[PDB]
Each structure stands twice: as structure tokens, then as C-alpha cells.
Amino acid sequence: WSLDMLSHPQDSMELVHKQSKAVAVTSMSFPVGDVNNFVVGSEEGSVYTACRHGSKAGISEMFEGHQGPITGIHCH
Amino acid sequence: TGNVLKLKVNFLPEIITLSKEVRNLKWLGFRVPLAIVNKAHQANQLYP
């Protein structure tokens, strides 16, 4: 959401498709050091590089690797 | 004492179940029943 506009989270950059499922992200933190990579880490790895918009705000360049729920998700 | 009353809802009825359901549909629809899958379909984008 915007810094002044947070009456609803506007930029709903869903790091999933538009199907019918609770495709969650375990402890999906953004990248540490302000690299802004909102790593949406699903229950079976899939640490999606969920960004703001474009054709890369999700699981396109998924920086996964976690054997299980990718929870500690924050870059260097 | 005094027959006073607070309020409550049914969102709290599946807190840990919603956490497990979110993780289940997060990976692939984990080892749960079919009714749990239908409940996940009717609750995933409906918990608001």
C-alpha cells in the first residue's frame, strides 16, 4: 500500500495465480538490507521473489531452496 | 453477575486449522479430508 494510502493494501501482488486455493507463504519477509525482494516462501520451498508489479513480482525468479516451508526469507 | 454480555464470532473457530489449511494449500493440498479441501476452497479467499 502507499505510505499515505493504507486504507486497504492496494498493490496486491499475489505471488500465486488466480485459482481457488490458499497458496500461502510461510513467514514471508522481505529482503534484509532493503533489497526489497518480498520473498513469499511457500510451505514447500518456493521462496517467490514477490515484488511490486511487472512480470517478476512473484514466483518467476523464485529464489527458493528451503527443504520445507521457506520461512526465514530475507536476503543479504 | 448481572447477565451482562460481550461479543464473539466464528472466525476464531479455525485459527490453527486455518494456519494448517494455509500451509496445506500453500504446497499442494496436504493430507487432510475432502471436506477439509472443500472448506479450504470456501475459506482460502473468504477468511476476510
- For residue B11, the distance in angstroms to the closest alpha carbon of chain A comes to 16
Residue of chain A minimizing CA distance to B26: A23
Give CA–CA dist A22/B39, Å, rounded. Answer: 11
Q: How was this structure determined?
A: cryo-EM
> What are B23's three cell numbers?
500451509
Residue of chain B minimizing CA distance to A42: B26
A44: chain B residues, CB-CB within 8 Å:
26-28
A33-42: long-range pairs with CB below 8 Å, 24+: A33/A75, A33/A76, A35/A75, A35/A76, A37/A63, A37/A75, A38/A13, A39/A63, A39/A70, A39/A73, A39/A74, A39/A75, A40/A15, A40/A73, A41/A66, A41/A69, A41/A70, A41/A71, A41/A73, A42/A69, A42/A70, A42/B26, A42/B27
Cβ-defined contact of A21 to B41 (cutoff 8 Å)? yes
Give CA–CA dist B25/B41, Å, rounded. Answer: 9
> What are B21's three cell numbers?
489449511
Of chain B, the end-to-end C-alpha distance in Å amounts to 34
Contacting residues for B15 by C-beta, under 8 A, at least 6 apart: none
- Listed residue (A76, A27, A33, A32) closest to A47, CA to CA: A27
A25: chain B residues, CB-CB within 8 Å:
26
- For residue A1, the distance in angstroms to the closest alpha carbon of chain B comes to 18
Give the torsion through C-alpha atoms of B23, B25, B27, B33, to 10 deg: 90
